[PDB]
């Protein structure tokens, strides 16, 4: 138990694929438990976007702003490893990205 993600300012958009369930609150809780700040809005302070089936506008903004854009598996792996894991190993997915 340690503030391993103290330098992270996260914005979280984690949804079911069919867009009916928003699971962002539980990933928010996991991140805060590791010392991160989680922003309610995707402002200029945000360093990390945790993305699953979120808004296309969020995907695009994360890419264009050059923030770390990671899957939920990143959050789990930091937790289970007790370490700030390399974000490049956990690229987020967007099934519509090349369409
Ligand atoms: Cl799902």
Domain regions of the chain by residue span: 1-99
Give the closest residue to 51 by CA, choosing from 88, 15, 80, 4.
15
Report the separation in Å between the CA atom of 19 and the middle of ligand 1, taken as the mean of its atom positions. 8
Q: Hey, which bits of 1-99 come out as E strands? A: 9-14, 37-38, 48-52, 68-70
C-alpha 88 to ligand 1 mean position (Å): 23
CATH number of 1-99: 3.40.50.10190
Q: What is the resolution of this structure in A?
A: 1.5
Q: How far, in Å, CA of 25 to CA of 8, rounded?
A: 16
Rounded Cα distance, 36 and 24, in Å: 14
**How many Å lie between the centroid of ligand 1 and the Cα of residue 29?**
19
From the CA of 71, how far away is ligand 1's center (Å)? 13
């Amino acid at each position: 138990a340690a503030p391993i993600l103290k330098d992270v300012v996260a914005y979280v958009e984690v949804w079911s694929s069919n867009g009916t369930e928003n699971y962002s609150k539980t990933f928010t809780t996991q991140l805060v438990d590791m010392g991160a700040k989680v922003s309610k809005t995707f402002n200029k302070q945000v360093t990390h976007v945790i993305f699953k089936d979120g808004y296309q506008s969020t995907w695009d903004k994360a890419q264009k702003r050059g923030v770390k854009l990671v899957s939920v598996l990143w959050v789990e792996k930091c937790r289970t490893a007790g370490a700030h894991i390399d974000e490049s190993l956990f690229p987020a997915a967007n099934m519509n990205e090349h369409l």
